[PDB]
């Protein structure tokens with residue numbers, strides 16, 4: 566289920582983080598604009614970039630922490646606030662977060678693994694509602 | 703579902719509030735110790751006590767608001783905080799609340815209405831979880 570999924574992703578965090586983030590960037594090309602150093606690079610080129618692996622891993626590490634702290638897939642208000650006031654997120658709207666989770670859910674469904682995709686869909690929706698109440702447009 | 707259940711209970715609150723608090727007290731006789739004037743009385747006698755009906759209704763008026771304010775059966779941290787800080791609850795532990803929901807879920811399953819008993823069970827567990835986080839033993 567949801568808790569096992571967190572253990573699965575953490576077990577090979579580097580791999581899952583890179584593949585899911587690329588799935589996100591290629592599904593929503595407009596989103597790459599927020600990462601100027603990823604522009605004009607193929608998937609393999611990015612997988613070779615030290616900063617790419619490190620950053621994506623850090624993004625997913627925090628996502629897993631928030632997911633582990635949640636109750637019944639509902640994130641803590643404090644975690645939502647933390648994501649909203651991070652300077653790196655200053656110019657983001659809930660729309661950007663919805664797209665990430667759509668790509669994440671689609672990735673899980675398309676993989677071979679037995680992820681609890683329904684819970685992740687729920688988690689993403691609840692997280693987006695939480696960002697909204699936290700003041701994100 | 704859960705949201706419709708809130709509307710159903712609100713539509714005949716006094717009746718539902720009395721029958722369920724009675725179900726609770728009769729399943730757990732020991733819990734009546736927290737309510738001084740309820741010992742040694744039959745159900746019909748309690749229902750004729752103005753104080754019994756007035757307080758049980760107020761208890762359910764608030765319970766429905768907490769449920770209404772919840773996201774995915776997860777109550778707001780602030781509502782959990784209010785319940786723990788209420789002076790009338792200074793001598794309670796999460797066990798008392800757990801028993802109340804066991805009785806409430808049993809009541810719904812035994813009735814003939816189409817209540818979403820599974821959701822109320824989840825709500826009860828998540829609320830107990832929230833009470834513990836708010837400092838209740």
Ligand code: HEM
Pocket residue numbers: 596599600620623624625627628648653654657661662665
């Ligand atoms: C709950 C989902 C998300 C989490 C947990 C998260 C987490 C993080 C973290 C921890 C960092 C700092 C990384 C470091 O230490 O270098 C970061 C940076 C950043 N995030 Fe997010 N993020 C999320 C969603 C998003 C979304 C949806 C966007 C917009 C497409 C976004 C855009 C950025 C940008 C532009 C940076 C700075 C760029 C960089 O480090 O190269 N994030 N994020």
Ligand code: HEM
Pocket residue numbers: 733736737757760761762764765785790791794798799800802
């Ligand atoms: C989350 C479920 C509960 C809610 C929303 C709730 C709400 C309330 C409210 C609003 C009052 C004040 C009523 C007034 O104005 O007189 C009250 C009083 C009280 N509650 Fe609760 N309560 C809950 C659960 C419990 C439980 C589980 C117990 C013990 C098993 C309990 C014991 C009491 C007592 C002893 C009083 C004062 C006695 C009385 O008014 O006769 N409550 N509660």
Ligand SMILES: Oc1ccc(I)cc1
Pocket residue numbers: 586620621624665
């Ligand atoms: O560096 C990164 C990686 C993933 C996401 I999402 C945002 C920024």
Ligand SMILES: Oc1ccc(I)cc1
Pocket residue numbers: 723757758759761762802
């Ligand atoms: O007055 C009341 C009503 C319901 C419950 I539960 C406790 C006290």
